[PDB]
């Protein structure tokens, strides 16, 4: 019951890590809104999760479109109650180095990750600040803390999210809204994990002291801790959940 | 039941944050060994905690004395079972800058913090490695991540613990032992917090959240890091600091 | 003579820190290209600097416009020689928190800082990689390492630059191109310094003063120099102790 | 002449990186004192360096012995003038994980690195603070910023130095003494480099090579110089990109 009486909106909640966050949040007693670019996916996943009295509802929105994400959060609150938590999990990745990256792809990666975090937070903050209560979990990555070959826009975007999190915590922690970033290591099994996939495999695994990559469930547990009132003194943190990657 | 079937030794467990960690760990179903320089206090605190079927036992040891901390860990395991977790909470603080610090005072702060973490971990690691299962939580501080005026030895000590944590995670994460460091902000109410007490408003201003931490705040982070829900968390310097290191 | 036979392009070179970098680089024997949104300013500043045989030339370009910045870099190389160094100094700042920021202003701040760094680097990298020799200095800030109240877009932008720098170093260090970021503390006297204008502010700086454009320029000149041959991927704090406390 | 009228004491100055620092500092016009555990080595190295008008003097001291390091600094100042800079370069390394490290070896690694930095700085700070002028460069490592397998005591010691540097900068930057740490990557060619001696190790370095003593020396000379007047509290990675990935 660690999230009893919490109401959590999760962007990109239809699949992957976002969906695993939803499952764990429901386990802990929260009501959840899955907000995803793919409306059908958000609704199918919310149906799948709403067993045994658990309450999950789905909403379609592109986090890069201010009016759409704002409308989704408004609909979510009308449906499941005023938000107490927001997880800015929506993100995309792609390849391209500074010398050869496509400028349009660059912009889209920055938009979904950085602009989406900004716009979804902006929508949620109106209510959270009014109520002097909220918790926002942003999505960094090991790729936001160190450099990853051939991923210039993505490392820029996740780097932006890491420090934006610090900035938001500076503004809002004293006003009742905690803001933290989870920084996951590689999670292979999601759509993104598959997108980014022998000797080269072994070298990649060798960057992880724990000797395995992460699961969506591994990351979801850290997010559930940060959302909970047991983390009342945690704000502004870039919490590495990465099997040791950034420790070496 | 987040720590069901866990057996957790907590150095400095007799009081303050260590005691709060013990309370939360028992809440989550763990068996706890309080290991404290003050043997009587460890025992009395363990007795106090042991209600409602909760199992806490107290042991005396100075973490800077290898034979003594080794004996205490062995005795704990005889009493409550093989360790699954170790919290290196024992620490001392003090004042003194590089230009005026006394060498003996410097050495003692380094000893309890860094050498204690080393020796207590060394003792626990034999069993944890043998069983390919363990979780160690070390105690950094905001004072291990940034510089604090007039606390040279203490900032060096906590700085050491922060990077030693990364080093330990590098060695052991693949062998079944996670090692992490909680880095608390100021916690006023403990013996250490009291010891270190417009100057007030200035200190508070460094904390975006607008208050200092409680032992309970810190205990919750430690309980998370101890739990199997934190299975992919290792090598982390986890700031639990009201936003201090974010600005 | 620390930058003898070096050819350095400096975005935002017409004024402020960029101009101070130009002055110091010329002192050390470099030829410099001042690339500024304000073309007249770039030209006037370059002429002012071109004394005692020093070679400084001005170019007009908005770093957020790929064609324009690419053209300026191409012309710089035609004018003063193939680049050996690029300083992505161009940046803008503004105020606004997540809950109330102008989304258009947010985009412009991200564009000049992050996209400008990307596009200018992209143009320079063709030649630098072809020659297996280059040094790129990006502009972070203390605002890219910690959070600053009421500056969401700018902290996001400088945060991006800090980690983009690491990413660029990962790609290119082994190919002969070092990439580093200078992270300055507050520098009062520039246009940006004045725009953003406080014993409380000063209290954030252990050294007990804010920085000068010259302070920052010296760090950039070191990073540009071959004396810094093993320095790459670094986020170098030049900040009077700000991020140390 | 970047260090004209500077007077720099270098612990561990008789060989390796310390000696390279001495050479570069003399190049830039400083007077130097080499203070080394090996007195004869300090003397021989100082004599070797004292050509063409360069002034280098050697002294014997174990930095872990307060009386010895204090005497050496005093003797240095009698010979070459009041110190303006101190480089806490003396250090030792060794292997051992938490589970198997010998406690005596642990203490010795912690002592030379951390306690030596403390004691040497303490001796130098009396004069520097009295004059409201100094610059201190401590020696971290990539091993002070991240974990290195099988080097528990050394990683703890270098970690201590990195944050002690921040703490010292907090105390003294406003009192006229800058304090910074260089954090070098692997440097193969020194006594320590040889002691610790694969392609797997090299793969940790984006730049595709290990460092030289000269690479590290240049960063130290920059930090010592007044061109770095606003640089304090910094943990400056000079590491071929190691900590960037
Ligand atoms: N998979 C990894 O290895 C990994 C590692 C570190 C961090 N991350 C980060 O974790 C988060 C989740 O990653 P994942 O692996 O679960 O991703 P995923 O691609 O498996 O799932 C992402 C979900 O977000 C949605 N989405 C994409 N763009 C959107 C938009 N503009 N608006 C609303 N929704 C949108 C997708 O439709 C999708 O359902 C991301 O921010 C990602 O960058 C992933
Ligand atoms: N109180 C704070 O503000 C604060 C902030 C950040 C980090 N910390 C750290 O948290 C930890 C706990 O702090 P606290 O405020 O609870 O401390 P505390 O002084 O209130 O209590 C510490 C306990 O450790 C025991 N202890 C001391 N030396 C010991 C030794 N050599 N061997 C065994 N036990 C010993 C004491 O007897 C005591 O019971 C420490 O590592 C401390 O450095 C404290
Ligand atoms: N002044 C400070 O306190 C401070 C502190 C840390 C970092 N910085 C950073 O240092 C850099 C320089 O700052 P400054 O104080 O000298 O700035 P400034 O505003 O004084 O000067 C900036 C120059 O860049 C030019 N410029 C602006 N937009 C451009 C564009 N789209 N394309 C090309 N040129 C453009 C301007 O015309 C101007 O000449 C910036 O990246 C800034 O973010 C400044
Ligand atoms: N060589 C590397 O790969 C590397 C990398 C990063 C950092 N470092 C650090 O750089 C510094 C220099 O390393 P190096 O490779 O030149 O070492 P080195 O072993 O080659 O030389 C060190 C010198 O310090 C002296 N010394 C040792 N103990 C002393 C003591 N107790 N008191 C006074 N002098 C003492 C030695 O006599 C020796 O002349 C050290 O702090 C080291 O930890 C080295």
CSV table of C-alpha atoms in Angstrom, one decimal, chain D:
chain,number,residue,atom,x,y,z
D,1,UNK,CA,56.8,33.0,-18.7
D,2,UNK,CA,53.4,31.8,-17.4
D,3,UNK,CA,54.9,31.2,-14.0
D,4,UNK,CA,57.2,34.1,-13.7
D,5,UNK,CA,57.9,34.9,-10.0
D,6,UNK,CA,56.1,31.7,-8.9
D,7,UNK,CA,57.8,29.5,-6.3
D,8,UNK,CA,56.4,25.9,-6.5
D,9,UNK,CA,57.0,23.0,-4.1
D,10,UNK,CA,56.3,19.6,-5.7
D,11,UNK,CA,55.9,16.5,-3.4
D,12,UNK,CA,57.1,13.3,-5.1
D,13,UNK,CA,59.0,15.6,-7.4
D,14,UNK,CA,62.0,13.4,-7.9
D,15,UNK,CA,60.6,11.3,-10.7
D,16,UNK,CA,57.5,10.5,-12.8
D,17,UNK,CA,54.7,13.0,-13.1
D,18,UNK,CA,56.2,15.2,-10.3
D,19,UNK,CA,59.4,15.6,-12.3
D,20,UNK,CA,57.6,16.4,-15.5
D,21,UNK,CA,55.7,19.1,-13.5
D,22,UNK,CA,59.0,20.5,-12.3
D,23,UNK,CA,60.4,20.7,-15.9
D,24,UNK,CA,57.4,22.5,-17.3
D,25,UNK,CA,57.2,24.9,-14.3
D,26,UNK,CA,60.9,25.8,-14.9
D,27,UNK,CA,60.1,26.2,-18.6
D,28,UNK,CA,57.5,28.8,-17.5
D,29,UNK,CA,59.9,30.7,-15.3
D,30,UNK,CA,59.1,29.3,-11.8
D,31,UNK,CA,61.6,28.3,-9.1
D,32,UNK,CA,60.9,24.8,-7.9
D,33,UNK,CA,61.5,22.6,-4.9
D,34,UNK,CA,61.4,18.9,-5.4
D,35,UNK,CA,60.4,17.2,-2.1
D,36,UNK,CA,60.6,13.4,-2.3
D,37,UNK,CA,60.7,10.4,0.0
D,38,UNK,CA,64.0,9.6,-1.8
D,39,UNK,CA,66.2,12.5,-0.8
D,40,UNK,CA,69.1,11.5,-3.1
D,41,UNK,CA,66.7,11.3,-6.0
D,42,UNK,CA,65.3,14.8,-5.2
D,43,UNK,CA,68.8,16.2,-5.1
D,44,UNK,CA,69.9,14.5,-8.3
D,45,UNK,CA,66.8,15.5,-10.2
D,46,UNK,CA,67.1,19.1,-9.0
D,47,UNK,CA,70.7,19.3,-10.1
D,48,UNK,CA,69.8,17.9,-13.5
D,49,UNK,CA,67.1,20.5,-13.9
D,50,UNK,CA,69.3,23.5,-12.8
D,51,UNK,CA,70.7,24.4,-16.2
D,52,UNK,CA,70.4,27.6,-18.3
D,53,UNK,CA,69.6,29.6,-15.2
D,54,UNK,CA,66.8,27.4,-14.0
D,55,UNK,CA,66.5,27.2,-10.2
D,56,UNK,CA,65.5,23.8,-8.8
D,57,UNK,CA,66.3,22.5,-5.3
D,58,UNK,CA,65.8,19.1,-3.8
D,59,UNK,CA,64.7,18.0,-0.3
D,60,UNK,CA,64.0,14.7,1.4
D,61,UNK,CA,60.7,14.2,3.2
D,62,UNK,CA,58.0,11.6,3.8
D,63,UNK,CA,54.8,13.5,3.3
D,64,UNK,CA,53.2,11.3,6.0
D,65,UNK,CA,55.6,12.6,8.6
D,66,UNK,CA,54.5,16.0,9.7
D,67,UNK,CA,57.9,17.1,11.1
D,68,UNK,CA,59.7,16.1,8.0
D,69,UNK,CA,57.4,17.7,5.4
D,70,UNK,CA,57.2,20.9,7.5
D,71,UNK,CA,61.1,21.0,7.7
D,72,UNK,CA,61.3,20.5,3.9
D,73,UNK,CA,58.9,23.3,3.1
D,74,UNK,CA,60.7,25.6,5.5
D,75,UNK,CA,64.1,24.7,4.0
D,76,UNK,CA,62.6,25.2,0.5
D,77,UNK,CA,61.4,28.7,1.4
D,78,UNK,CA,64.8,29.7,2.8
D,79,UNK,CA,66.4,28.6,-0.4
D,80,UNK,CA,64.0,29.7,-3.2
D,81,UNK,CA,61.5,32.1,-1.5
D,82,UNK,CA,58.1,32.0,0.0
D,83,UNK,CA,55.9,29.4,-1.7
D,84,UNK,CA,53.2,30.6,-4.2
D,85,UNK,CA,52.3,27.1,-5.2
D,86,UNK,CA,52.2,23.5,-3.8
D,87,UNK,CA,51.6,20.3,-5.9
D,88,UNK,CA,50.6,17.4,-3.8
D,89,UNK,CA,51.8,14.9,-6.3
D,90,UNK,CA,53.2,12.2,-3.9
D,91,UNK,CA,51.2,9.1,-4.0
D,92,UNK,CA,51.4,5.3,-4.0
D,93,UNK,CA,49.1,2.6,-5.4
D,94,UNK,CA,48.6,-1.1,-4.8
D,95,UNK,CA,46.1,-3.9,-5.3
D,96,UNK,CA,43.6,-5.5,-3.0
D,97,UNK,CA,39.8,-5.7,-2.8
D,98,UNK,CA,37.7,-5.0,0.3
D,99,UNK,CA,37.4,-8.8,1.0
D,100,UNK,CA,41.1,-9.5,0.9
D,101,UNK,CA,43.1,-6.3,1.3
D,102,UNK,CA,45.7,-6.2,4.0
D,103,UNK,CA,44.9,-3.5,6.6
D,104,UNK,CA,48.5,-2.3,6.9
D,105,UNK,CA,48.8,-1.8,3.1
D,106,UNK,CA,45.4,-0.1,3.2
D,107,UNK,CA,46.6,2.3,5.8
D,108,UNK,CA,49.8,3.1,4.0
D,109,UNK,CA,48.0,3.8,0.7
D,110,UNK,CA,45.6,6.1,2.6
D,111,UNK,CA,48.4,7.8,4.4
D,112,UNK,CA,50.7,8.7,1.5
D,113,UNK,CA,47.8,9.9,-0.6
D,114,UNK,CA,45.3,11.5,1.8
D,115,UNK,CA,47.3,12.2,5.0
D,116,UNK,CA,50.2,13.4,2.9
D,117,UNK,CA,48.0,15.8,1.0
D,118,UNK,CA,46.7,17.0,4.4
D,119,UNK,CA,50.0,17.4,6.1
D,120,UNK,CA,51.8,19.1,3.2
D,121,UNK,CA,48.9,21.5,2.6
D,122,UNK,CA,48.8,22.3,6.3
D,123,UNK,CA,52.5,23.2,6.4
D,124,UNK,CA,52.2,25.3,3.2
D,125,UNK,CA,48.9,27.0,4.3
D,126,UNK,CA,50.5,28.9,7.2
D,127,UNK,CA,52.5,31.1,4.9
D,128,UNK,CA,50.1,31.1,2.0
D,129,UNK,CA,47.2,32.3,4.2
D,130,UNK,CA,49.4,34.9,5.9
D,131,UNK,CA,50.2,36.3,2.5
D,132,UNK,CA,46.6,35.8,1.2
D,133,UNK,CA,48.1,34.1,-1.9
D,134,UNK,CA,48.6,30.6,-3.0
D,135,UNK,CA,47.5,27.8,-5.4
D,136,UNK,CA,47.4,24.1,-4.4
D,137,UNK,CA,47.1,21.3,-6.9
D,138,UNK,CA,46.1,17.9,-5.5
D,139,UNK,CA,46.3,14.6,-7.3
D,140,UNK,CA,43.1,12.7,-7.8
D,141,UNK,CA,42.9,10.1,-10.6
D,142,UNK,CA,40.2,8.5,-12.8
D,143,UNK,CA,40.5,6.1,-9.9
D,144,UNK,CA,39.2,8.8,-7.6
D,145,UNK,CA,36.1,9.4,-9.8
D,146,UNK,CA,35.1,5.9,-10.6
D,147,UNK,CA,35.7,2.4,-9.3
D,148,UNK,CA,38.7,0.4,-10.5
D,149,UNK,CA,38.6,-3.4,-10.0
D,150,UNK,CA,41.0,-4.8,-7.3
D,151,UNK,CA,42.1,-1.3,-6.0
D,152,UNK,CA,40.0,-0.7,-2.9
D,153,UNK,CA,42.4,1.4,-0.8
D,154,UNK,CA,43.6,3.4,-3.8
D,155,UNK,CA,40.1,4.2,-5.0
D,156,UNK,CA,39.2,5.3,-1.5
D,157,UNK,CA,42.3,7.4,-1.2
D,158,UNK,CA,41.8,9.2,-4.5
D,159,UNK,CA,38.1,9.6,-3.8
D,160,UNK,CA,39.1,11.3,-0.5
D,161,UNK,CA,41.5,13.7,-2.4
D,162,UNK,CA,38.8,14.6,-4.9
D,163,UNK,CA,36.3,15.8,-2.3
D,164,UNK,CA,39.0,17.1,0.1
D,165,UNK,CA,39.9,19.4,-2.7
D,166,UNK,CA,36.3,20.7,-2.9
D,167,UNK,CA,36.4,21.2,0.9
D,168,UNK,CA,39.7,23.1,0.8
D,169,UNK,CA,38.5,25.3,-2.0
D,170,UNK,CA,35.4,26.1,0.2
D,171,UNK,CA,37.6,27.2,3.1
D,172,UNK,CA,40.4,29.0,1.2
D,173,UNK,CA,39.3,30.4,-2.2
D,174,UNK,CA,38.0,33.6,-0.6
D,175,UNK,CA,41.2,33.9,1.5
D,176,UNK,CA,43.4,34.0,-1.6
D,177,UNK,CA,44.3,30.3,-2.0
D,178,UNK,CA,42.9,28.4,-5.0
D,179,UNK,CA,42.7,24.6,-4.5
D,180,UNK,CA,42.1,22.2,-7.5
D,181,UNK,CA,42.7,18.5,-8.3
D,182,UNK,CA,44.1,17.1,-11.5
D,183,UNK,CA,42.5,13.6,-12.1
D,184,UNK,CA,44.9,11.8,-14.5
D,185,UNK,CA,44.1,8.8,-16.5
D,186,UNK,CA,46.7,6.0,-16.8
D,187,UNK,CA,50.2,7.1,-17.4
D,188,UNK,CA,52.3,4.0,-18.4
D,189,UNK,CA,55.8,5.2,-18.3
D,190,UNK,CA,56.3,6.1,-14.7
D,191,UNK,CA,57.5,3.9,-11.8
D,192,UNK,CA,53.9,3.6,-10.7
D,193,UNK,CA,52.7,3.0,-14.2
D,194,UNK,CA,55.2,0.1,-14.6
D,195,UNK,CA,54.4,-1.2,-11.1
D,196,UNK,CA,50.7,-1.5,-12.0
D,197,UNK,CA,51.3,-3.3,-15.3
D,198,UNK,CA,45.4,-4.8,-21.3
D,199,UNK,CA,44.1,-4.0,-24.7
D,200,UNK,CA,41.0,-4.2,-22.5
D,201,UNK,CA,42.5,-1.5,-20.4
D,202,UNK,CA,43.3,0.7,-23.4
D,203,UNK,CA,39.7,0.3,-24.6
D,204,UNK,CA,38.6,2.4,-21.6
D,205,UNK,CA,40.3,5.4,-23.2
D,206,UNK,CA,38.5,7.0,-26.1
D,207,UNK,CA,41.6,8.8,-27.3
D,208,UNK,CA,43.2,5.5,-28.1
D,209,UNK,CA,46.4,5.9,-26.0
D,210,UNK,CA,47.5,6.3,-22.4
D,211,UNK,CA,48.8,9.5,-21.0
D,212,UNK,CA,52.4,10.8,-20.7
D,213,UNK,CA,53.8,12.6,-17.7
D,214,UNK,CA,54.1,15.7,-19.9
D,215,UNK,CA,50.3,15.5,-20.7
D,216,UNK,CA,49.6,15.7,-17.0
D,217,UNK,CA,52.2,18.3,-16.3
D,218,UNK,CA,50.7,20.8,-18.7
D,219,UNK,CA,47.3,20.7,-16.9
D,220,UNK,CA,49.1,21.2,-13.6
D,221,UNK,CA,51.0,24.2,-15.0
D,222,UNK,CA,47.7,25.7,-16.2
D,223,UNK,CA,46.1,25.3,-12.8
D,224,UNK,CA,49.2,26.8,-11.0
D,225,UNK,CA,49.2,29.8,-13.3
D,226,UNK,CA,47.4,33.1,-12.7
D,227,UNK,CA,45.6,32.6,-16.1
D,228,UNK,CA,43.6,30.1,-14.0
D,229,UNK,CA,42.6,32.8,-11.5
D,230,UNK,CA,38.9,31.8,-11.5
D,231,UNK,CA,39.6,28.1,-11.4
D,232,UNK,CA,39.1,26.7,-7.9
D,233,UNK,CA,37.5,23.5,-6.4
D,234,UNK,CA,37.8,21.8,-9.8
D,235,UNK,CA,38.3,18.1,-10.3
D,236,UNK,CA,39.9,18.4,-13.7
D,237,UNK,CA,39.9,15.2,-15.7
D,238,UNK,CA,43.0,14.8,-17.8
D,239,UNK,CA,42.3,11.3,-18.9
D,240,UNK,CA,41.9,10.7,-22.6
D,241,UNK,CA,38.1,10.6,-22.2
D,242,UNK,CA,38.1,7.8,-19.7
D,243,UNK,CA,35.5,9.3,-17.3
D,244,UNK,CA,33.4,10.6,-20.2
D,245,UNK,CA,32.2,7.1,-21.1
